[PDB]
Amino acid sequence: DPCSNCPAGTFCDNNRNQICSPCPPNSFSSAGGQRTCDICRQCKGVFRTRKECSSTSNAECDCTPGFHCLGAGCSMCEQDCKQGQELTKKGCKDCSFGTFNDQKRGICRPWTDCSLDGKSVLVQGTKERDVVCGPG
Amino acid sequence: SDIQMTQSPSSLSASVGDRVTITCRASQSIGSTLNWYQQKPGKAPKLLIYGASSLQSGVPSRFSGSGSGTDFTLTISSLQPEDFATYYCQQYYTWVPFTFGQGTKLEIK
Amino acid sequence: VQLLESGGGLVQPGGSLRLSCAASGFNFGYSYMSWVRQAPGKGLEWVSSIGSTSSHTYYADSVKGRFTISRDNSKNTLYLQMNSLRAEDTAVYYCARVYSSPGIDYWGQGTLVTVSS
Numbered sequence: 298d299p300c301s302n303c304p305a306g307t308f309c310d311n312n313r314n315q316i317c318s319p320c321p322p323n324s325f326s327s328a329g330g331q332r333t334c335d336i337c338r339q340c341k342g343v344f345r346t347r348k349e350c351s352s353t354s355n356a357e358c359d360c361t362p363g364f365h366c367l368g369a370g371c372s373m374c375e376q377d378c379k380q381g382q383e384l385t386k387k388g389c390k391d392c393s394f395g396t397f398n399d400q401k402r403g404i405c406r407p408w409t410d411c412s413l414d415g416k417s418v419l420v421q422g423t424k425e426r427d428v429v430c431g432p433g
Numbered sequence: 434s435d436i437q438m439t440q441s442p443s444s445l446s447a448s449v450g451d452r453v454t455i456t457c458r459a460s461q462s463i464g465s466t467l468n469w470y471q472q473k474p475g476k477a478p479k480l481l482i483y484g485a486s487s488l489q490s491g492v493p494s495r496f497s498g499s500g501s502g503t504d505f506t507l508t509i510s511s512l513q514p515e516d517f518a519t520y521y522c523q524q525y526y527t528w529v530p531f532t533f534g535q536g537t538k539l540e541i542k
Numbered sequence: 543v544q545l546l547e548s549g550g551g552l553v554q555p556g557g558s559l560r561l562s563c564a565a566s567g568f569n570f571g572y573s574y575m576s577w578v579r580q581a582p583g584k585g586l587e588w589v590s591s592i593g594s595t596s597s598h599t600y601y602a603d604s605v606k607g608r609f610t611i612s613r614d615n616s617k618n619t620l621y622l623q624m625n626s627l628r629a630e631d632t633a634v635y636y637c638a639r640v641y642s643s644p645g646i647d648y649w650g651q652g653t654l655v656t657v658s659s
Contacts (some may be wrong), residue, residue, distance in 0.1 A: 483643045
């Protein structure tokens with residue numbers, strides 16, 4: 298069937314005297330063939346317009362400052378990860394035993410190994426603080 | 434004109450202790466921009482699931498949201514007495530307007 | 543966190559009402575406020591929304607040019623000026639808040655708007 302040959306930004310029209318037609322406003326077709334253009338996603342409420350919607354691409358969504366896009370195609374706005382945890386695929390998860398993040402918008406990096414530098418573990422570390430070393 | 438949410442089934446009889454599976458179908462791919470609500474008669478709705486999968490604070494782990502694209506399912510394991518209500522699925526893909534499902538009424542035998 | 547709807551009641555078609563929602567227990571200023579209605583027996587239909595910015599007022603097709611959403615972030619109050627009220631408008635109206643999650647987390651108790659066809 299001819300509709301296979303419709304390029305992105307068009308949809309296969311049933312109207313005769315035309316195989317395809319260009320996507321209506323506020324609707325996109327990122328692949329060729331589609332019998333219908335999909336409605337452009339709105340970046341409103343708790344979202345913000347990163348990229349605009351073209352007849353060939355959806356609008357890409359962005360998050361407020363102090364927040365980050367969480368989820369497939371930014372289907373969430375998670376708040377920037379607090380001290381003592383790192384941002385993972387499945388949102389904001391706490392640091393593992395033996396690692397720490399002592400800041401906001403940070404990443405869990407392992408505790409200092411005091412012995413490695415001929416030192417001893419004066420104070421142990423938490424999920425939010427590093428091991429304080431002492432002499433051996 | 435706009436995005437059509439279609440829940441399946443319209444009504445569902447189930448006995449306590451079971452696991453239930455409500456469907457919600459979006460008229461187009463809407464990624465994971467789906468919410469789940471529970472409404473008990475006379476009371477206002479309550480948010481269960483936001484972003485198709487994550488739970489709101491307070492909701493028990495027996496309620497679990499799944500799906501991405503067109504087909505989404507709310508699953509309630511170990512049906513509890515207080516879990517008998519009408520459930521609604523909402524989309525926020527479009528904010529103007531956000532659209533809800535017709536609702537699925539959960540009942541007893 | 544609380545949301546108290548008022549101003550609903552019984553009106554003749556063509557008439558008008560002013561709904562009010564009283565917020566407390568959160569930052570009203572930084573909340574995307576909405577009205578969702580539910581006619582008796584039926585389900586939930588979005589009505590209107592207003593951004594934290596208070597410059598963006600969005601409306602459902604059926605209430606465009608009749609209803610008007612407004613907010614007074616000083617008195618932490620949301621309003622719905624419903625004019626030219628029709629029979630189809632008979633419903634319980636709820637004020638609903640989106641804070642940081644994309645789902646509506648806090649709903650009010652509702653106020654009943656009734657039209658005498």
